[PDB]
Design an enzyme around this catalytic site. Sequence first.
Site, PDB file in Angstrom:
ATOM      1  N   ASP A 146      22.597 -50.790 -27.121  1.00 55.03           N
ATOM      2  CA  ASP A 146      21.755 -49.608 -26.870  1.00 55.03           C
ATOM      3  C   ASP A 146      20.291 -49.920 -27.198  1.00 55.03           C
ATOM      4  OD1 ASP A 146      20.883 -47.102 -26.093  1.00 55.03           O
ATOM      5  OD2 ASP A 146      21.946 -46.033 -27.702  1.00 55.03           O
ATOM      6  N   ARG A 150      13.940 -45.531 -28.446  1.00 60.24           N
ATOM      7  CA  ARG A 150      14.459 -44.469 -29.304  1.00 60.24           C
ATOM      8  C   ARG A 150      15.303 -45.017 -30.451  1.00 60.24           C
ATOM      9  NH1 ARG A 150      16.940 -44.206 -24.379  1.00 60.24           N
ATOM     10  NH2 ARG A 150      18.996 -45.230 -24.470  1.00 60.24           N
ATOM     11  N   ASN A 151      15.717 -46.275 -30.382  1.00 61.03           N
ATOM     12  CA  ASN A 151      16.472 -46.907 -31.461  1.00 61.03           C
ATOM     13  C   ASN A 151      15.639 -47.900 -32.276  1.00 61.03           C
ATOM     14  OD1 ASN A 151      18.934 -45.535 -31.332  1.00 61.03           O
ATOM     15  ND2 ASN A 151      19.684 -46.757 -29.620  1.00 61.03           N
ATOM     16  N   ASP A 164      20.306 -48.513 -34.879  1.00 63.74           N
ATOM     17  CA  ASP A 164      21.124 -47.720 -33.975  1.00 63.74           C
ATOM     18  C   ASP A 164      21.623 -46.498 -34.733  1.00 63.74           C
ATOM     19  OD1 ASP A 164      22.925 -46.562 -32.165  1.00 63.74           O
ATOM     20  OD2 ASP A 164      23.737 -48.485 -31.518  1.00 63.74           O
TER      21      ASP A 164
END
Length: 282
Positions: A146, A150-151, A164
């Site tokens: 991912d 945003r992580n 994460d």
Amino acid sequence: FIDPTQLPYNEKWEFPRNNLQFGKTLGAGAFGKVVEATAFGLGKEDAVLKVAVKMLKSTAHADEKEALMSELKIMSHLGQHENIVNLLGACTHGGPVLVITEYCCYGDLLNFLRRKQLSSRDLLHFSSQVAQGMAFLASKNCIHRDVAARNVLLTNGHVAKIGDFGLARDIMNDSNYIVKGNARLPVKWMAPESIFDCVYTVQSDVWSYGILLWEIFSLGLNPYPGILVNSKFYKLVKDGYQMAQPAFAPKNIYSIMQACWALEPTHRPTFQQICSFLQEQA
Ligand SMILES: COc1ccc(COc2ccc(Cn3cnc4cc(C(=O)N5CC6(COC6)C5)cnc43)cc2OC)cn1
């Protein structure tokens, strides 16, 4: 190389849950949340540190407990690195599982770019620090799956750390996670071999890192602006469509993103190659 993903948990991480003072919540998912907290006497230095604690919510059981455990075991084997959100401790006895990690005061990279003043040197630093973190995960044989702004978190010095939220991300209500069968997947960040074949490798993390480079040098635009995720978008990515260069991306950085978007996963660069090139660029 020498270790698969089957090891149990190392009790050396255990911290007494009664030395934790919980503060504000920082984010929540369907079965997990992340809370600010103060640890009282953590580590060898007896610090009283602000930390983040990942834990399951009121309503979960069965695999959820296992998934948090698996998150914890995965992080206990990475070790410490400056450019990841490091494990600091855990409470696995006498109560629910608590995973104690570093607290990154400035929040996530994406909202930082959107809130913004920055500089061209600041974006290259973010790109290089994330690349170092991913190279460390790669060298541990760990597939992130991912990779996205945003992580990425920013901590003191505005140093970037890849992490994460896992169970603590509200994925069900985030339009960036597309319904696909029985899963919610960040399709716009994903390598084609991973969308179609559900194949996840280091090389597919490299593709997602290219999307992340586009986010950084666009200052946080949503990838593929104006293009809805549907069959046509899938045909576009498979046919080799690539987003145009971000306005603030120097040609050299854009060439990195293109190399990351090679349709053939072996033709993408490794994270260490990206570090070195980002390194020479300075
Ligand atoms: C590759 O494998 C890996 C590697 C590492 C990991 C572990 O990752 C994580 C662990 C823990 C957290 C939780 N976490 C910490 N500091 C945080 C700050 C914010 C915030 O928004 N902030 C700071 C603020 C100022 O007001 C409060 C605004 C939100 N949550 C925060 C986040 C993680 O990842 C992003 C997993 N998998």
